[PDB]
Amino acid sequence: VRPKVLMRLSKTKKHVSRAYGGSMCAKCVRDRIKRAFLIEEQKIVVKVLKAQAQSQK
Amino acid sequence: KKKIRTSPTFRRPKTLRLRRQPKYPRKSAPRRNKLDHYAIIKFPLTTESAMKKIEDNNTLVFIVDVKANKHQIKQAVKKLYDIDVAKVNTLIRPDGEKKAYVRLAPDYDALDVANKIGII
Amino acid sequence: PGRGAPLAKVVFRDPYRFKKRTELFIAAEGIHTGQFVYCGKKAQLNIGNV
Amino acid sequence: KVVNPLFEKRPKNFGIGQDIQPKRDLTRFVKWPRYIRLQRQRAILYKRLKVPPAINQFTQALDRQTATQLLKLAHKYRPETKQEKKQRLLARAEKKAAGKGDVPTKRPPVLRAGVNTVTTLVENKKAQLVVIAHDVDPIELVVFLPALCRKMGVPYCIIKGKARLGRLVHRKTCTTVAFTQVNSEDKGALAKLVEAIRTNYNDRYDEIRRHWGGNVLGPKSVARIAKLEKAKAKELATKLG
RNA sequence: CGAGCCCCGAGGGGCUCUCGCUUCUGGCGCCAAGCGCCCGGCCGCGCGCCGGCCGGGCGCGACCCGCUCCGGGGACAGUGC
RNA sequence: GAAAGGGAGUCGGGUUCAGAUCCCCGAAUCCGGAGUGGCGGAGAUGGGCGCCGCGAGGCGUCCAGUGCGGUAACGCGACCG
Ligand SMILES: [Mg+2]
Ligand SMILES: [Mg+2]
Ligand SMILES: [Mg+2]
């Protein structure tokens, strides 16, 4: 609809029942979930790696 | 140990502004309302079209002051004719006068209201 | 319009407040969208780094 | 022991590119109003430039202890206020109406104030002590006063704050005050003050005349110059011996 | 953390880059966690740093000091005659 | 600073000598307001344990409860911030 028509639409007509629903597409939401999880896992990996590397003087 | 500037911008500090407390009124008395109800309603229009509006649409046609809006016209008619009005339509005539079509409430009859005004 | 060089719209993080800062770099040839560009003294020699 | 296991440390590291910086003190880096910048830069200029001795002599003020004794003495000779002048005038009117008469009754010694009054007293050699504020902003009203006082032989001191002299004379500001004749019980304290003040000001007038001021660089410039000096001194130390 | 500069007793100060936390990903990131010191109220061991429960403040976290915001020129440029 | 740009929401029939998407008739719709809250609906009204009660169902206590469905795309009348 036109932007000022959205003021009189109900909430359900303007979003989708999902995180970032009505603002981001499902495919890129999945991509962002996977990206966040895997990059945090990578941070854990590099922290563990330097922790086991610093065990020697 | 607590006065800190967390922003690099100096803004003008907020100072109180007193409300005016004048020692004399600049005008001795208020100027009265020149646009009272008698001034608002000048004279009714009694042409054939106005009579047709009276007998058909339950509408009284008046010539009003050009500065009077629909609310003022409605209240003036309500006060000085003791009738309830449904709506007011307003135009400005080519000669400069303002003309108001005042449609009365359904329980008020424009014909005998015009009779008691004196414009039958 | 008016220039022959493409312009690169690059988004940075504001280091002091929660906000995204958008710049209008001049596109060095070879850079693409979705690429990370690094600006500062400790940046490495790569195309697009400042 | 009973601490909730859900509680934990959540430290944020403020390295470059990491969690955004905390709201810290930026007073050194504030865009100041033009009047604040102007007064601060004037203060800096008075240390950059070579201040001639006639203006620089006012930086030498009395120490806090000596100023405290001087003001404590001068508090006994403050000029009479408007209300107590009214009281004294009414008392004189009553007394003259009934029945004593004129009765001058020994108009008491009082601290004379004002640069013109003090200058006339010094030129007439009537003042026993001259006190000059150090911060007269149009600094021409009192630049001649140290030299004039020294030539006429009256002891003079420079004190911090024209506001204090103003508070002495029930006003906002006073450039100078003058001690003329004093009460017998305060003669000894005035003598000690005069001795110390003459030791500090009138006796070393000859090098007060020559002590230029200012001509000091900024801390950054001083640090840079000293860094260069040390950079060559560290190798000259190995060169020697 | 560091190469360990150099003393080395293997301690360690004078002595250098570091007086740093971010580079494989088209994520996220603010409005402090934690600690310490206090100030109230509640019921209440009813001996006080003393039982616990609802609130509020400060400090460290986030080093100290300082005289130009930071940098580039500069007695030239420039301006007036 | 636009009666041609952006800009919510009015249509059908009748009517005059000359007016109508403006009057009349009939169907709607937008924006704003409601402090004393206009009515409904949603939130939201379930499980556990002891009892009473032939069963169903009632009593007391304790614990939940800022909605729900579809593998998904997404859907349902609301759906704290
Ligand atoms: Mg109109
Ligand atoms: Mg338009
Ligand atoms: Mg027509």
From Swiss-Prot, chain A:
It is found in: Cytoplasm, Cytosol; Cytoplasm; Endoplasmic reticulum. This is Large ribosomal subunit protein eL34. GO terms for molecular function: cadherin binding; RNA binding; structural constituent of ribosome. Belongs to the eukaryotic ribosomal protein eL34 family. Transmembrane segments: none annotated. Component of the large ribosomal subunit. The ribosome is a large ribonucleoprotein complex responsible for the synthesis of proteins in the cell. Keywords: Acetylation, Cytoplasm, Endoplasmic reticulum, Isopeptide bond, Phosphoprotein, Ribonucleoprotein, Ribosomal protein, Ubl conjugation. Component of the large ribosomal subunit. One of its GO terms (biological process) is cytoplasmic translation.
From Swiss-Prot, chain B:
GO terms for biological process: cytoplasmic translation; translation. One of its GO terms (cellular component) is cytosolic ribosome. Residues 1-38 are annotated as: Beta-like import receptor binding (BIB) domain. The modification Phosphoserine is found at residue 7. GO terms for molecular function: cadherin binding; RNA binding; rRNA binding; structural constituent of ribosome; TORC2 complex binding. Residues 1-31 have a biased composition (Basic residues). It is found in: Cytoplasm; Nucleus. The modification Phosphothreonine is found at residue 9. Belongs to the universal ribosomal protein uL23 family. The N-terminal beta-like import receptor binding (BIB) domain mediates interaction with IPO5, IPO7, KPNB1 and TNPO1. Component of the large ribosomal subunit. The ribosome is a large ribonucleoprotein complex responsible for the synthesis of proteins in the cell. Binds a specific region on the 26S rRNA. May promote p53/TP53 degradation possibly through the stimulation of MDM2-mediated TP53 polyubiquitination. This is Large ribosomal subunit protein uL23. It comes from Homo sapiens. The gene is RPL23A.
Swiss-Prot record, chain C:
It is found in: Cytoplasm. This is Large ribosomal subunit protein uL2. Belongs to the universal ribosomal protein uL2 family. Disulfide bonds: none annotated. Component of the large ribosomal subunit. The ribosome is a large ribonucleoprotein complex responsible for the synthesis of proteins in the cell. This protein can be partially incorporated into E.coli polysomes in vivo, indicating it can replace the endogenous protein. The modification is impaired by hypoxia. Component of the large ribosomal subunit. Interacts with CRY1.
From Swiss-Prot, chain D:
The modification N6-acetyllysine is found at residues 9, 72, 192. GO terms for biological process: cytoplasmic translation; maturation of LSU-rRNA; translation. It holds the Pfam family Ribosomal_L7Ae. GO terms for cellular component: cytoplasm; cytosol; cytosolic large ribosomal subunit; cytosolic ribosome; focal adhesion; membrane; nucleolus; nucleus. There is a cross-link at residues 23, 72, 100, 220 (Glycyl lysine isopeptide (Lys-Gly) (interchain with G-Cter in SUMO2)). The keyword Cytoplasm applies. Its main location: cytoplasm. It is linked to Chromosomal recombination involving RPL7A activates the receptor kinase domain of the TRK oncogene. Component of the large ribosomal subunit. The ribosome is a large ribonucleoprotein complex responsible for the synthesis of proteins in the cell. Component of the large ribosomal subunit. Interacts with CRY1. Interacts with DICER1, AGO2, TARBP2, MOV10 and EIF6; they form a large RNA-induced silencing complex (RISC). Belongs to the eukaryotic ribosomal protein eL8 family. PANTHER family: RIBOSOMAL PROTEIN L7AE FAMILY MEMBER. This is Large ribosomal subunit protein eL8. It comes from Homo sapiens. The lineage of its organism: Eukaryota, Metazoa, Chordata, Craniata, Vertebrata.
